[PDB]
Write a protein that binds this DNA or RNA. Structure first.
Lengths: 322, 321
DNA sequence: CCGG
């Protein structure tokens, strides 16, 4: 019993319920306000398991001790930690999102700052590295998205928790996000796995970015590795400044479906973005353009995909009929 | 053993290929050189694929290989020689040979084309029979060359003939392969599938290239059969006016072949539109009959996503219904 | 007094 995977999963399960309840308190008011300020209702908050870490030292810790859970289990789960005058909660006075497995089991939490006087000055904090929670492989929204990415042959990587919420609410049920860290290799590996039918990868990685420099960072990065999924990788970028949560407030739910639908392939975006910062209106800047982007084509390892982008260069700079 | 082993048999075929290659430069090998040069294959080409000529006579190669030390038991086992009444004799006579190899380049047999008018063998093409090395249902011409580019490019191009593979490779299509003697089956298909995975998780696009249309029909018919997993990744391309890839190169040059490949169609799309091509789209009552023939076909697609993408376009292909 |  003591400290098993199923025991820790039962603790995090108990903790999520407690935090979910705590969202309906008086001191939780600004946590609810954060949600409703960006158009998330009481239905939405319940759908994603949203909760409030209350004030005090050991609200949760005692709650789980009083329903059987020994402290040594709770520290290994990442819920509590050793304080000077005994045990205490990890999370305090913050809006929480339960981070689940694809099976739907809670392994940890993402917590946002609400109050100015909160000692923890970081904007977001997470459950630390545990047996269950692993930063580099865990994803928010994967429980809900699992079915529709396998069916849809499509994943939509977004930055934040509220960005996953806004996408899923707008119909884009394939949206997910990396929790407290950069999107990575074993995140990719996990999503790739679900999109397999037979022994064949099949689908679309759609990376949604906010701010165009953040998109251009992914662009210049696209040519780096073995370019394993590059052919099936795509970029969409919201109207300058915005993110999927904001886009849904200003321009409604349809604007997200279109943003996702009108994604650009990763290499195309990278190349054409470099052409965008050039003068295509003379013979000099036409040559300067090819002089920088033909090398980018040269780096493409798939000869099939390389030849496709070679064909479209003279079109994009201006030297031929598009 | 020492005599009649696998590596010994490969040595016999390797020798045989070297012998037949040399023989292509002979005087009586004029029409065999003519066959190649007539369809735009120069001396550089002929040496790449290892083209050769089987000489006139009875036991030309066999004697040459017996001088090299090979026993008759080995040469018969290799499918190079055979027992005639007054002694051993060659399998091939007075014919342009191409050696057929493994993916690692090891010669396992030959494909021979009829040249002369007074050839004893009536067949247009002859092959090495079933040996320890030569299995007709898994053997493919050009695989040694295409091996790499099929894996990296994630693309194979299946053509009908030897000259079609040659034409494709000279034209820059370095993913072209061909069946030898029999039609393209599952053991060929299942090998290229294995290959295009790239020792990994990759789906590659398999591109069939047909001369006429009965083949395109036969492939269109077979598109919907049983579990149809690799049918989704299969593609078809057909040359205009019923020409093979070799003659498409002769007349319309190397640019046609590369773009024939580029302008290939999905197998399902080809099959559906082939059926639409046999109906009167002029009247509005014809438009409706066409829609009615095709949603049964679209219905037979087992993948939901493909079906939806094919049911989408069905308006456009009917001429707006 | 070959083989196909």
């Amino acid at each position: 019993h003591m400290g098993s995977r199923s025991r820790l999963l039962a603790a995090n399960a108990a903790a999520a319920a407690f935090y979910a309840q705590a969202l309906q308190s008086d001191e939780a008011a600004p946590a609810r306000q954060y949600l409703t300020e960006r158009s998330f209702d009481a239905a939405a908050a319940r759908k994603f398991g949203c909760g409030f870490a209350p004030s005090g030292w050991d609200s949760l810790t005692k709650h789980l001790q009083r329903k059987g859970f020994e402290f040594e289990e709770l520290e290994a789960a990442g819920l509590s930690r050793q304080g000077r005058h005994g045990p205490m909660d990890r999370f305090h006075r913050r809006l929480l999102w339960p981070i689940r497995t694809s099976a739907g089991e809670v392994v940890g939490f993402g917590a946002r700052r609400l109050f100015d006087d909160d000692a923890m000055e970081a904007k977001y904090v997470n459950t630390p590295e545990t047996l269950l929670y692993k930063k580099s492989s865990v994803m928010f929204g994967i429980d809900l998205a699992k079915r529709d990415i396998a069916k849809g042959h499509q994943a939509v990587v977004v930055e934040g928790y509220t960005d996953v919420m806004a996408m899923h609410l707008a119909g884009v049920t394939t949206a997910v996000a990396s929790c407290g860290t950069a999107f990575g290799g074993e995140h990719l590996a996990m999503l790739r796995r679900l999109m397999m039918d037979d022994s064949f990868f099949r689908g679309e990685l759609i990376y949604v970015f906010d701010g165009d420099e953040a998109g251009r960072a992914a662009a210049l990065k696209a040519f780096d590795g073995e370019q394993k999924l590059a052919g099936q990788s795509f970029v969409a970028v919201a109207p300058d400044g915005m993110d999927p949560c904001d886009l849904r407030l200003k321009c409604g739910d349809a604007a997200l479906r279109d943003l996702v639908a009108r994604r650009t392939p990763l290499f195309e975006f990278a190349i054409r973005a470099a052409i965008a910062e050039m003068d295509l209106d003379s013979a000099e800047g036409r040559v300067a353009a090819l002089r920088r982007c033909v090398p980018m084509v040269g780096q493409i390892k798939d000869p099939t995909l390389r030849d496709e982008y070679a064909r479209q260069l003279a079109g994009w700079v201006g030297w031929a009929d598009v």
